[PDB]
Amino acid sequence: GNVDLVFLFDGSMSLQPDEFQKILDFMKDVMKKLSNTSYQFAAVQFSTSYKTEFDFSDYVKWKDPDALLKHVKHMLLLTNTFGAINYVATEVFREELGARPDATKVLIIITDGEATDSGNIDAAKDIIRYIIGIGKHFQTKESQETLHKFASKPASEFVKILDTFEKLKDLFTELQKKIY
Ligand SMILES: FC(F)O[C@@H](Cl)C(F)(F)F
């Protein structure tokens, strides 16, 4: 079956340059490992504001992850996660931007800290949502649990807590094996 997958990636000032680069490299690696499959991809950077770095139609045009993310600049502002998820739901999953009506909608949210905004993500309820929380801001159970509201249920499936950015590589086998 077809899968339309969006990477929603944190560009806040909490991320160090090498950490941000590791997020980019992970997205590229995931795409390369799923090239010429039923997958199509889009990517959105979020910080204070939201930017579609490439749409599904861009992916279909280029099919080159290096090219698609070549123009990304680290935003270096806040962490407005609620609005970011709603932005994906309303502004990226659109047929006119290459989204396929028959596809399963999937979000991979990648962040290094707690949201600086609030509200709800009701608009994104029909999207299958994974969240990857990385690094020392998620050392405590309480901090980890703040991510549950953004992800699908059960949290034990959809919330991934990684202690280091180097651990992103450990997700590839699992991601490749998913059958939606
Ligand atoms: F299932 C895919 F969406 O990848 C999952 Cl395991 C994710 F956690 F890496 F995002």
Concatenated DSSP letters for 104-173?
EEEEEEEESS--S--S--GGGTTSEEEEEEESGGG-SHHHHHTTGGGS-S-HHHHEEEESSGGGGGGGHH
Q: Where are the beta strands (DSSP E) in 38-88?
A: 39-46, 50-54
Residue that has been written with the tokens 């949502």 in this structure: 129
Q: Name which of 138, 180, 132 is nearest 160 in CA terms.
A: 132
Q: Assess whether the C-beta atom of 155 lies below 6 angstroms from ligand 1.
A: no
Alpha carbons 73 and 70: distance in angstroms, whole number = 9
Experimental method of this PDB entry: X-ray
Residue 174 alpha carbon, nearest atom of ligand 1: 6
DSSP state at residue 27: H
Q: Is 162 in the pocket of ligand 1 (CB under 6 A)?
A: no
Q: What's the CA-to-centroid distance between 131 and ligand 1, angstroms?
A: 8
Decide whether any atom of ligand 1 lies within 6 Å of the 130 Cβ.
yes
DSSP 25: H
Measured from the CA of 110, which atom of ligand 1 is nearest?
10
User: Could you tell me which of 13, 18, 105, 88 has the C-alpha nearest to residue 53?
Assistant: 88
Query: What does the domain layout of the chain look like in residue ranges?
Result: 1-180
In CATH, what is the architecture of 1-180?
3-Layer(aba) Sandwich (3.40)
Rounded to the nearest angstrom, the distance between the alpha carbon of 73 and the centre of ligand 1 is 24
- In sequence order, what are the residues at sequence separation of 6 or more whose Cβ sits closer than 8 angstroms to the Cβ of residue 119? 82, 83, 86
105, 4 Cβ separation under 8 angstroms: yes
Residues 6+ apart with CB under 8 A from 178: none
